[PDB]
Amino acid sequence: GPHMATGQDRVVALVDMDCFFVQVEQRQNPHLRNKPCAVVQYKSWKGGGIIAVSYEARAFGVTASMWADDAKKLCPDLLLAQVRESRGKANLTKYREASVEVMEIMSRFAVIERASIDEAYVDLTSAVQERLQKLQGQPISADLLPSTYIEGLPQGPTVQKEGMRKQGLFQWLDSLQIDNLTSPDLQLTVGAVIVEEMRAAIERETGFQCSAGISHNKVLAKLACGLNKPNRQTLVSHGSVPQLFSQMPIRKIRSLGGKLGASVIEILGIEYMGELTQFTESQLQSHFGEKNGSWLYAMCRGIEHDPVKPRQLPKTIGCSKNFPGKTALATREQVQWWLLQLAQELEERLTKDRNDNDRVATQLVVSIRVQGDKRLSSLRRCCALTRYDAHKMSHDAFTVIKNCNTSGIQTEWSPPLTMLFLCATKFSAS
C-alpha cells in the first residue's frame, strides 16, 4: 500500500542515435542522403560485412550482420560506404569522433552515462525539478512535445500515424495534474520536454537525428526508446507498465537477451515479462541467484535502481583484429607484424586520449584466439603499460603470449592465431 515503493523517484532518459554510422557517412557525403544505404567493413570476402543500415534500406530487408553481396540481392541499388582502413585493419575513428560530438552536447543538459558509441543515459531528475518551478503550475502544451509518443495511448474511443500520436498525447496531457509538483507523470512529461530540446540541439549542431526514451529508470528508458524509431521519442509511464509487459517477450529487456533470459523462460515456463509478477522474490532468487532474483522481482513491476553513472568517456581503449579461415597467423613474424599494427593504432588513440582527457592508462591487456576454439577469447593476459610506445607495447604483448606457441619450431606458430587484441585499461589522472 502506502509503504510499497513504486520506483518513480527518478526521471531517466536514453538517447540513441538513428542508424548512426550511416548518418555519419551521409553527413559527409550528401549523395548518400535519403537513400537505401549501409556501412560496410572490408570488401574482399562476400562484399564485406554490413554493420549499419539506413531505414530506407531496412525496408528491403537489409540488416547489419549481413554480407554486402547478400544485401545487394535484396536491394540492388543499395549504396555502400566503407569503414576506413589503416595499418591493415578497420579503423573506427570517424565514428568515435562523431560520438564525442553528440556526447558533449548532451552533457550540457545533464550528467550522462556513455552506454555505447551512439547512446547515453541521462538522469533528468534535478533538471525536471528546475523546469517545473519556472513553469509555475502552467500546463504543458502539446506544442512542446512535437515528436513524443505516450506508450499505451490513445485508448478507448485514427488512420494516420501522426494523427494517432497526437491523439495519445492529447489524452495524456488532458489527464495531467500539473498542480502537483511531485506527480511522477508530470515529472516524466517535463523530462520529455527537456529531451525534445536535447534532441533538437543534437540535430541542429551535428545534423544527426536520434530517438529517445523517457521513463523512471534505465531499463524502461531503453525499452521506450526503441518503441518509436527513428526520429521520435517515447514516454513510458509507471502506469503503462502492466499492459506493456503483458505481451513483452522476456528477451526484449536489456540483460535478458541471452542465456539468463532463456533460463527464465525454460525454468518458469513463461514467455512475457509481465508473467514474472506471479513469483515471490525468494522464488526468483532461488532460480537465478540473489542479485538477479531481486532485480527480476522489481523489474517486472517497472522498478529498477541502477544509477546513471557519471561517465562520459570509455573506461578502456582497445584494438582488435580477426584473422579468419586461411588468413590465420602461422608465422612468428606475422604475429609480430600485426601486434605492431595494433600497437601503433593503440598508441595513436592513447596519445590523443591523454591530451584530451588528462589521464594515462596503466595496464595493457593482451588477448588471442587460436584456431579451434569458438570462445571469443582463448587467452587473456595483462602486463604493465608504462610508456605510450607501440614498439614497446607490441614487444611486451609478444612476450606474454609467446608460450602459447605449441610448435617446437619457433619460426612457426601453432595453432595459428585467429585473433589479436590489445587493450589499455586502469586509467589514472594525469
Place this chain on the structure above:
DNA sequence: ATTATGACGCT
C-alpha cells in the same frame, strides 16, 4: 568468414 569493440559479473 557475424568484426570491432566496450561494460560488468563471477570466483
Place this chain on the structure above:
DNA sequence: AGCGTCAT
C-alpha cells in the same frame, strides 16, 4: 586476475 556474459 582471468574468464564469461551481454551489449552495440
